[PDB]
Amino acid sequence: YRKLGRTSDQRKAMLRDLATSLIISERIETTEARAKEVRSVVEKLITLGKKGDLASRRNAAKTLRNVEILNEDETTQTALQKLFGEIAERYTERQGGYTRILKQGPRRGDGAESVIIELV
């Protein structure tokens, strides 16, 4: 696996935060390496969501941050609830994938290959 030029605690934190944000937005923009490394984490969380039993819920609560989404009509529900009620159904029949990645050109401030990781 990759280290992302960062320590262990700071990476653990970055990976879980990036996975949460992806789950919120359903497509985000970042650099190639971190997309390549958040792919597995988000894919595994969705797996914890395709079962929905209380054990998998409690276990997926480890990674996701506690965030609130305001849906249409001022309806509110958290990241766990999204994962287990709006994304489990979408991928009940698909047996992998769950994400795609679309390389983009280098950014200006660096030569970093920005990419967009999106939930498929």
Partner: protein, 48 residues
């Protein structure tokens, strides 16, 4: 640990023979015809 002598213009230009930027990996985009980087999304159109 200091240059014992000058590096003449000949030696200088010689060392930097291999110091150059490569032309980008660009291919034409199938939806718009403008060039794009290969394996990247066209920035003019937004396709594949």
């Amino acid at each position: 640990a200091v240059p014992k002598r000058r590096t003449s213009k000949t030696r200088k230009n010689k060392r930097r023979t291999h110091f150059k930027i490569s032309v980008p990996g660009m291919t034409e985009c199938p939806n718009c015809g403008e060039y794009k980087l290969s394996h990247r999304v066209c920035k003019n159109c937004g396709s594949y």
